[PDB]
């Protein structure tokens, strides 16, 4: 499920996951209110609107769900 727009990411959210959007930042958290996903506008070092992905323990993931520290900054 990698190639989505932001609108379908927010619309296909899993079961129990809620989300909130404010000033162009989206926070999505799972049923445990754990932050799992964030969409952000560009900052100084990332110059593109990106997705952030986070496991059950808030670790950065890449497209493949593998834990990462670059690859953590996922276009959509």
Contact call for residues 68 and 62 (beta carbons, < 8 A): yes
- How many whole angstroms separate alpha carbon 26 and alpha carbon 34? 14
Residue 14 binding other proteins, by CB under 8 A? no
Pick the closest to residue 25 from 8, 44, 10, 45 (CA basis): 10
Site for Mg ion in 11-50 (CB under 5 A): 46
Give the residue, chosen from 36, 51, 61, 73, that forms a contact with Mg ion under the rule CB under 5 A. 73
23 contacts other proteins (rule: CB under 8 A): yes
Q: Which positions lie near other proteins, rule CB under 8 A?
A: 20-23, 25, 27, 29, 32-35, 38, 40, 43-46, 52, 56-58, 60, 69, 72-73
């Amino acid at each position: 499920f990698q190639g989505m727009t932001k609108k379908e990411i927010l619309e296909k959210l899993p079961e129990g996951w809620k989300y909130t959007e404010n000033n162009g930042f989206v926070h999505v958290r799972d049923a445990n209110d754990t932050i799992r996903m964030r969409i952000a506008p560009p900052d100084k070092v990332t110059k593109y609107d990106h997705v952030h992905l986070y496991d059950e323990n808030k670790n950065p993931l890449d497209l493949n769900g593998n834990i990462v520290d670059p690859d953590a900054h996922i276009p959509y």
